[PDB]
Symmetry: C3
Subunit: 300 residues, 3 copies
Amino acid sequence: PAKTAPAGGEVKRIKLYAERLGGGQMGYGLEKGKATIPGPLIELNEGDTLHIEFENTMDVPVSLHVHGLDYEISSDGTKQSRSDVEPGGTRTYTWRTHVPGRRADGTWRAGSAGYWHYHDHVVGTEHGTGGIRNGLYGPVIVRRKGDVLPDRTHTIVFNDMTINNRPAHTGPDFEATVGDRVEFVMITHGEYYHTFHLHGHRWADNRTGMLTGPDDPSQVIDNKICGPADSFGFQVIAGEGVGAGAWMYHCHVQSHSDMGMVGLFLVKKPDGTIPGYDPHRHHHGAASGKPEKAEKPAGS
Amino acid sequence: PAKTAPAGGEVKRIKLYAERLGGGQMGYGLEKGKATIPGPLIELNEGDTLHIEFENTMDVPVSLHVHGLDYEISSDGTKQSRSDVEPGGTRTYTWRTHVPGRRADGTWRAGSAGYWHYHDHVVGTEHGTGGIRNGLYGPVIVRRKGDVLPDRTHTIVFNDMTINNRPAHTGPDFEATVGDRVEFVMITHGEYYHTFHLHGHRWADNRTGMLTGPDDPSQVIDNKICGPADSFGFQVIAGEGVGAGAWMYHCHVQSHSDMGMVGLFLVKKPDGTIPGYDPHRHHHGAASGKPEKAEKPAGS
Amino acid sequence: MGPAKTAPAGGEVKRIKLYAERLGGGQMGYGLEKGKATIPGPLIELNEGDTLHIEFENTMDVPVSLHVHGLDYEISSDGTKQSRSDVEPGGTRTYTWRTHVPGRRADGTWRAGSAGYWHYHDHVVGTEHGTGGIRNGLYGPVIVRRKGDVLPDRTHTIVFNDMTINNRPAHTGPDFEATVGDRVEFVMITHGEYYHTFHLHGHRWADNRTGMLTGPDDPSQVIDNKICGPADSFGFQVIAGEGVGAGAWMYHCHVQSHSDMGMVGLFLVKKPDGTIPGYDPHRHHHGAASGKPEKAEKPAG
Ligand SMILES: [Cu+2]
Ligand SMILES: [Cu+2]
Ligand SMILES: [Cu+2]
Ligand SMILES: [Cu+2]
Ligand SMILES: [Cu+2]
Ligand SMILES: [Cu+2]
Ligand SMILES: [Cu+2]
Ligand SMILES: [Cu+2]
Ligand SMILES: [Cu+2]
Ligand SMILES: [Cu+2]
Ligand SMILES: [Cu+2]
Ligand SMILES: [Cu+2]
Ligand SMILES: [Cu+2]
Ligand SMILES: [Cu+2]
Ligand SMILES: [Cu+2]
Ligand SMILES: [Zn+2]
Ligand SMILES: [Zn+2]
Ligand SMILES: [Zn+2]
C-alpha cells in the first residue's frame, strides 16, 4: 500500500486567468469565471517544467510570481523585471523544477521539492500589497520521487486576519473519514504573524511534515509560528489514535482566535456521523456553510 | 553513565484541581489550596496512559485541554465538545501516548514524545482566552525510551508580557551547581511573539534540544522566536565551558526585556560562589525573591 | 570545478583590536581601526577550537560593552553592568571568546560544538539591555566554522534592525554584487522590536546549521522565506543564479508594509560579461538611491 510520487521530467502546460471577484477582491482561475481564493493548486514532480499561459482579464496590471521554483528573471512577475501583464494582456510564464544531486565541488544541491506558493507582485504597489490583500495567491506543491501521496489536499491561507479571505468565523471546514490520509498546505500573507494549531493531531517540522524514520531528530509539533509568505505542509491520518470528531484548527494568537480565525477538520466515523457536533449553528453571528471540497491539482 | 527514560505503557492516575488564586488569577494544583502558576509538571513515558481525575473548585466553568498527546474528542476540554466542567464539578480526563513505528502502508508514524502543554479552553471565551490570561496552563513532557533524563526541570512561560504571570522584573531565578544537567520547558501564551534567549549556553533546535550525534544537521542556537501556544524544551550542562555565574535569560525583544521579562539562571561553584551576582539588588523597583524550586513531576 | 575550499581544524589563539566609536546621526559602531567603524561591525570568523582575545577600547564619551551569542565565554566577558564587564569612556578591556569542537561526554551524551552563525552587540547603551546601543548600530556578525565546512567566495551581512537594513535610510538597499556561479554566503541577523520574514527571489536554502543539506538523508525543509525576531541569527550559502541566471534578484522582508516602506535590496547577479539583463543602476525608488553595491566583508585579520 501507500501510493508514492513518480519521477518528474515532463513538460506541462496550463492556462491561468486573473479576474475580479466580488467586493473588491481578485483571484486566479483555470478558466474564465472560475477564479477562486486561494487560486488553484498547482502540483509538479521534481524535474517537471511548467508553461503557464497567462491572461489578465482585469482592467489593471497584474502579475504571477512564485516561491522556491526555478525561473528566469523574465518570469519573476515584477515591474522591475518588466515581467508583469497589462490589462487584457497575455504572457507565458515558465517555472522549472530540478532534482537533488551532487555538485562537482562536492556539495549537495537541494532539489525543488517542497510546499510553495505563487501570488501577485504588482497590484497596489510594486510589492503586490494590494493584489495579495485582494486574494491573488495560491499553493504550489513539488513532489520528490517517492514522496507519499495523500487522498486529498486542503489549502489554508492566513491572510491578515482572514482565512482564505473569508468573513470572520466562517471557517472553512474540511470533511474527512477516520483513516483518510489528508494533506494540508499552510500559507501566510499580509501584515501579521500567526500560530497555526490543529486539535488532536500533530506533524513533523521538516520538508514533508512526516518523519523519515527513527533517525529523524525533527521536533514533532501541533503548533507553528508563521509570518507573511511562509509556507509549509504536512499530512495526517485523520483521527489517528484520537477517533472521529469535529477537530478545531485555529490561529492560536488569542484575539485572532476570538475574532474568527478558526475552522473545523470534520472527521467522520465510517458511517458518516461525527460524535457531538451541531452543523447549522451560528458562531458570533456567522455560519461556516458547507465544507470546502478538496482541491484538485491543475491541468495537464 | 547518563540516566535514561524507561519504556512506557503503564496506566497512571492523578488528581487535578482548578482553583482561584489571588488577584483575579486561577491555577491548577495537585491538591486543594496547592495550585501554582504554571500548573504542575506532568511527565510520561511514550505509551503511558494518564487518567486525570479533575475537580473544578471555582464558581465558574473551566476545562483542561492538552497539546500533542492522544485523546478522544470527549477529552478535548471545550464547550463545543461538551467536555468542560461546571462549578464544583468533577470529570475524568484521559490522555494517551504512543511510540513511533511503521504503519501497514509502510510509512513512519511519529511518536508522542516531546515538550507539550495543557491549559484551559473555556474561561473568558470558548478559546480559553481568560483562563490562559488568568494562569491556567502548565507543562507536559513525554519521554521516548532512552531519552536522557535531567537532574532538574524548570518551566518558563511567556504569558503576554509576563514570565509565569509574575510582576515585572521578578524573575523567576533558577539555581544550579556547575555541571548539573538542567532541563528547561519553554511555553508561550497570549497575544505576543517573543524570542527566548539564555546567556552563556546553547542548545540544538530539534525534538530533545540535544544533537543525536555528528550526523544531526540541526542548527545549534541560543535564541528562538516563539508565538502563543508554542512549546519547546532542551537540556544544558550548567556552566559548561563558561563557568559559574548569574546567567541571564530573557525575551530578546528589546522593550520586553526592558519592561521586565528577564530572570537569572544562577550557576554556583560547589563552594557557593556565583560571580556577577548581587543578591540584594532591586531592579526597576522589584526583586526576584528566592530562586524557584525545580518542579517535581506529578506522582501517580 | 575542484572540491570546495573547507575550514581547517581550529585551536589557535588569536588576537584583534576593536574600537567602539560614535558615527554620524547619533549612531555608534565597532571598528578595527579608529575612524573605521562600520554598521554592521567587522565580521569575525573563527574555526572551532580557536580562542579570540579582543583588545577593546571605547572612544565614546559614554560607556559601552561587547556581548556575544553562541560562543564560550566566562562571566567577566559577559559585557553587562551586572557582571561588571562594560567599558568606561576612554577605557580598555580584554574580552575573550572561546570555542570548542563537538564530541562525546563521559556520560555518553554528545556535546554540541560552537559552530554556527552568531553575532555580537552592545549590552549597556541606553539600558542595561543594550537597547540604545543596538538601535544606534553596535552589532556585528560572528561565524564559527566546523572543520570541513564549505567556505564561500564572499560573505555578506544583512541585519534587519527595527525598520531598517543595517541602519540605512529606507529604500537604500544595500545591494550586493556577484557573478553567476559565485558561491555567496549570507549572514542574516535581526534586532530591535519587530518580527520580520526574510525572503530572496530566485534562490533557496536548507533550514539547518549551515544552510546547506548535508546529503540525500537530510530532512530539513528547503525554504526561500524565514520568520525571524530580535537577536535571531542564521546563515546560508547559495550558488548565485544557479538554475535561474543573471538578474537583479530582490531580497526583502516579506511583511507587506515593511517591503513597501523600504526593507528591500538587490542581489545583483551578473553574467560573465559583467552585464545584468533588464536592470538600471541610477534609478531612485520612493525618493532614495541605493548607492553603489556593498563590498563583501573581509573577516577580521
Ligand atoms: Cu518580492
Ligand atoms: Cu493569527
Ligand atoms: Cu489544542
Ligand atoms: Cu512572495
Ligand atoms: Cu446565517
Ligand atoms: Cu483550541
Ligand atoms: Cu517578549
Ligand atoms: Cu546573549
Ligand atoms: Cu492550545
Ligand atoms: Cu523589595
Ligand atoms: Cu542579554
Ligand atoms: Cu520586516
Ligand atoms: Cu519571491
Ligand atoms: Cu543578544
Ligand atoms: Cu539621489
Ligand atoms: Zn470561536
Ligand atoms: Zn533589566
Ligand atoms: Zn519597492
